[PDB]
Amino acid sequence: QCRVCSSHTGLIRKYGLNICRQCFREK
Amino acid sequence: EYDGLTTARYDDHGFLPGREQTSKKAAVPKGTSDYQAKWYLDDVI
């Protein structure tokens, strides 16, 4: 995530960008 | 009768009664945890 949410589902450790699979169409 | 029942007087919309039909079988080998006792020597007759 980037600190403007409490994002707990679909979490990301990949590649340091912290943008979810559900956040390619949001973030 | 206090010990000759299966269900308390809650009939009068609640429980289907859970029947615990005791059909025990022996535990022959040595050493038992919580688990392995009932799957020791099951002579399924």
Add this chain to the structure above:
Amino acid sequence: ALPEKVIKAYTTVGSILKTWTHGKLPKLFKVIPSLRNWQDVIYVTNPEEWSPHVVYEATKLFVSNLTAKESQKFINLILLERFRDNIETSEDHSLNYHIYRAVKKSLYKPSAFFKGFLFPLVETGCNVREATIAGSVLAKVSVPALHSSAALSYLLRLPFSPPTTVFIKILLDKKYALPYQTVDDCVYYFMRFRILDGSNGEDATRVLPVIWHKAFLTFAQRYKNDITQDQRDFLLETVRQRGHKDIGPEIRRELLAGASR
């Protein structure tokens, strides 16, 4: 320029004790302070990037083993970047196990606590809450009062900080006596607002959050006698231009009533 008998001991150390679980440990990392060259000790500590076990019990490399001059250990600088980690290097900013188990009971010689592995705090940059965190250090293990008038004569000579007055809060229920070269340090604190024609300057408004209401409160606690007595109205500008309502009349009594120490 060193022989290769000793160079070939401290390069492949990241193969054995990376995952410290059990066993009887090898004997070429503990022998670093056994080397009489202690230029080769304090910098070959690998200070800040470890995996397993380090904030409370067991870092005592020079506290009570040796004297209290060179590694007099703890609170500012050399390991600041690990002291600033686990309050600031996660989004929840909480505590865990690598930042729990093996430093903070270094205090068994607390004369080996105030120069030499971390200490020189309020001179060259420090935020509001790093003797509040070390208030847990100074309020879960012992503190002398020998250093209390070494942390009242010294800390107020310097540029200003909230951790100084946090030390004041931790260290003026010790109730052990004031040297008279010291008492003038804490008081120059509220006067400089008006000009008579003492006539004052530009450094007018000093305000800080809640531990400032809890910590000037520590220099306003109990006594009346052992100050330089002219400094009463110097501190009564908390009722005069900063007037208080709730806990107001429970402040002003460092200077009014009790028999001093």
Add this chain to the structure above:
Amino acid sequence: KPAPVRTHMRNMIIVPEMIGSVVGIYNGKAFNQVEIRPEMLGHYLGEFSITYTPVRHGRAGATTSRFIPLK
């Protein structure tokens, strides 16, 4: 019959030499008493485990404890 001395792994191999002694062996918690003989050859001491209250496919009575009585 000697004493049930405990042993708590799943990839350790016993060698047959020791006719006449007893060791208790890991089954998940407890220590199965084994009078150690040449009657085990290179197979795991921690193979002594089928660790569950048994799989209810013929008498499904503990599945009846998860269902819904309902008000």
Add this chain to the structure above:
Amino acid sequence: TETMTVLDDQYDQIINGYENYEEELEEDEEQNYQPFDMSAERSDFESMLDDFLDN
């Protein structure tokens, strides 16, 4: 009411060493600026080391 009360003016004289901490740090440093040894690290220093490279 501290009055001498040894030794409050110095508190055994580790009281000036926080402002000039790198000036009382030299009150022990100059004596032991030492080069390297193989015989004075330990006496049998070629006997009490090799416990590491073989796990």
Add this chain to the structure above:
Amino acid sequence: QTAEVTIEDALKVVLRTALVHDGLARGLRESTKALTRGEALLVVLVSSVTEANIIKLVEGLANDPENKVPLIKVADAKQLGEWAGLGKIDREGNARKVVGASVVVVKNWGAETDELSMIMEHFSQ
């Protein structure tokens, strides 16, 4: 061992006044045992003896003057117990009471390096 006059003016003026430091270690269990186990490099004694069951065997180091062996005595008995740690730590606001001792065993000296160790080599002439 014990203290001279110009170590009266060392001990009373410095160590007995060093009420925060108290760098001394005081006879019912251990100072003739400090003539047994071997952990006494400096001893400081007492001569207002009335607490002295072992001190009558510590005073084998009072009336036998190794020559670090100085022997001339001081008076006050409960010095550490009445001031400095074995009891009363009557100091800047304290008022305590624990029964103390009379037989100092100094091993180690801090910053006061050779202001305290004047009991070394200056009597046996």
Add this chain to the structure above:
RNA sequence: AAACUCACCAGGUCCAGACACAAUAAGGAUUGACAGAUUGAGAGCUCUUUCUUGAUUUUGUGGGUGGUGGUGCAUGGCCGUUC
């Protein structure tokens, strides 16, 4: 997918009293560069049985300084989000 991963488990202990004064506080309170016993299902740790100790700190206690309990309540910009 291997024990770790991996969010759970079958059994153990390194460790909690600071701040004041109260019992002992330097005859060992409690400290450590070490020698053993060390093992709980496999460990480092302890100092009763070499000796650093250095004034400091041991404990039945409570305000709570310790918010390294923040879930926060919104408040101040700032950009996923809603337009």
